[PDB]
Design a protein around this ligand. Sequence first.
Ligand code: NA
Lengths: 66, 66
Amino acid sequence: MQRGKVKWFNNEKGYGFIEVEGGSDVFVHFTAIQGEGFKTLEEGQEVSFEIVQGNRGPQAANVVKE
Amino acid sequence: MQRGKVKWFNNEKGYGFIEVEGGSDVFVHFTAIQGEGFKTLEEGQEVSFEIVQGNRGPQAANVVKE
Ligand code: NA
């Protein structure tokens, strides 16, 4: 698990990228976002998350908004 | 039917969140807003609305400023 801050999120498309210290930006899809409510993120939002590797490459999992 | 006050609304992006007494904040997209005028909301505006569940989580529908 790592903390990061959303760099960009296209709310209409439902995906974006998370900046992290000491790694490349991480793709995040809305289906990774946990908890109550409509699955969305704003740029600048701080989250905790894990990275998983699929056929498309690394992406965020278990994204929890701070 | 619910009543709330807009907590924040990004006019450029066309979405925000409504605060409701005794529940979690509810996402609102501009396409939910009813009426003739440009589809926008100011923070503090009183609104009536319904909550619609869906794949990406709950959001407001039939939002009326009144
Ligand atoms: Na980085």
